[model samples]
Target: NPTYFFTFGDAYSQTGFSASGTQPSASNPMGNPDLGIGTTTNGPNWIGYLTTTENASLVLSYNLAAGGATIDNALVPAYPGDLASQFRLFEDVYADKPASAPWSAEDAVFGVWIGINDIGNAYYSTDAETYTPKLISRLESLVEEVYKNGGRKFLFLNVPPTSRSPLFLEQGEEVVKQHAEYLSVYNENLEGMVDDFTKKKGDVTTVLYDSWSFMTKILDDPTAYGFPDATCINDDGTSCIWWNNYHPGMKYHLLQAEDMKPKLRKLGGW
Candidate 1:
């Protein structure tokens, strides 16, 4: 009776560009020959497990994750359309079905992973304080919108700590530590938001995936986890294992799948 599964988020959820459709290409960061990070035979992404497990009859997955999408893009007009615009698409997908449809109440699971770029860019653009509140408000609105669309179950992934990224590594150890502290503050706020949501919406089954813990684990001991060169930064300062400085490699995607399998199995009752 499982109808569909929906994923909404950024590059973390993306397999590749539409035109590429999982094919490796220089234009595609994951496919960059020099990097060859996500150019794996199995294809580039963490969503493959959904198809492999066949938990849902159909997968209604959409990739609204642009390379550098942020909360400001939703609040301000920096980008023509932003994360908020993408939520409208989720609304439309369900609206396409008739009100008398049999499975109207059987809402699909909504998996969301966003806000990383918002925080990352905020630090880079020197507007962290100005953007944090807007980002939080946007997330609150998104949770409400999902509920309105009959999404009783939600899996929200918080932003990973960015201080460990190659970008910060290149900046310097002192700066990286400072950035890590900054990310901690944002993540703390996110945790508070999750608690608030749970208290307000007792019926809404919501789970917060601890991306901060996951990322910090790897950052702290990459070698122990098979990440000998965690940063994967090349001599010229470009990341060797990732398509861009922010997106992860195929290995990272594979690890994510392994980490998420148990969670998904429990959620889907498989």
Candidate 2:
């Protein structure tokens, strides 16, 4: 059976797939768009690469990630399509395992890479101290929600080192320090959250990809990763590590997907 992959996140993980759009066929895998469309990278993102290129088996991908998604919009305002919104969409269309994409508990993996916009929006806020825990709590609840809905396999990617991005780097030392601390706190909490999730749910298979360390490795030595430099921002080419001030380029996504091949296999997603 083909492995069904459901992805949710912000621009970093989006592929613009629609449930009501054309379904994945032999000729066209992603179905909706001719090829997956990524907002930040302006090309195929990690999900796209996994679905189209890195498959150990036939993989059907459904990506519900919006451009500026947060765990919840009520806590930290984000674009209209937050995780809750994405869940609603999933319920409306794909949750039932329709004929267009039939996915079983053993043959599916739900991947989430959210929290960038949440921390970005509220990291410097006066009330920032109380925000991350709430978000992580809600994230735990959502994972349980997915389990309740028959999702048995999952992959969670923690937040990257956004403080090292060009946008944060240009903000001066103190500002960068604050963002770095917030991002670290978020990732640390996320690691604990995933541990709890795996321990509590005996039947579920969970893999937490360390995007923070992976991206940090790239940030520390951009030239080693084939980037001309870390600070150069360009969306039109692959020379720069960043597609823009805030987003990494498609090169990052491609390498990320390549790295995920083993993890996905371990989780039975590949």
Candidate 3:
């Protein structure tokens, strides 16, 4: 089967935090002052590129990336007036694909990496606990919409350990640790939704990238993973590794790509 890939998400899929200028500084909230935005020399984002290379048989690979998109906007109605409108660009492309070239269902694989921004925004706004469940429900509906649109293979990347970020360091060790635990709960709930969908629709293939596990592994032992001591925090007492307080640096993205490769290959049948 020829495999095509598509990504629908927020800043994580973006080569870097776009709002963060190439050379960001402390004054800017959109970009990480510590880690430069966009792609880096040794810091290639393996997630986006790997999906493309692993399934090179298909002629088209699309990345519908927006700097601040969220699953809440995609599936939820009342959260924002027109959040789902961001997906219209991809909808138009997919609708007009047959005119541009011969395409079929067997040749496509869709990867959705959304919802993280929703949680991030909530946490930044100090309302994450109140919003997580609603976000999960919205995400579940998005999966159904993709399935209805001729998507057979789906990869739903779960949220990384959000509490592990340097921003949490200010909350001290106990709060930071609790944040990790909270993320685990969210992932478990999201996985349960995937399982429920699978039971209802037998032919659809689905996989969950345990982003929490992957990120926690690194946070637990950055040195063991070869992350530079300065990767997580900067010399000025601010978190340096992120493009903003929410995004990861190029080096971190590479590590994620390596950790995810085997699972992606197996899941996509590459």
Which candidate leads the pack in lDDT?
Answer: 2
Q: Pick the candidate with the highest TM-score.
A: 2
Error of 3 at 2 (Å): 4.6
Candidate 3 stretches with Cα past 4 Å from truth are: 16-43, 52-59, 74-83, 99-102, 123-131, 171-178, 230-244, 266-269
* Cα RMSD (angstroms) for every candidate in the order listed: 6.5, 1.5, 7.8
lDDT for each of the candidates?
0.56, 0.83, 0.56
Give the per-residue lDDT digits (tens) of candidate 2, residues 1-270: 678788888989776777778787666777776564645786778888888888877777788888889998887887999987887787788788888778889888899999999988888983445668888998888777778879989999999988888898899889888988888888888988898888888888889999988888888888998887778988863778888899987888888889888877876646
Candidate 3: give its CA RMSD in angstroms.
7.8
Error of model 1, residue 74, in angstroms: 5.1
Estimate TM-scores for all models: 0.75, 0.95, 0.73
- Which candidate would rank higher by TM-score, 2 or 3? 2
Query: How many residue pairs clash in each candidate at the backbone level?
Result: 0, 0, 4
Candidate 1 local distance difference test against the native: 0.56
Q: For candidate 3, list the clashing residue pairs, or say none.
A: 20-31, 31-243, 32-243, 32-244
Candidate numbers, best TM-score first, in rank order: 2, 1, 3
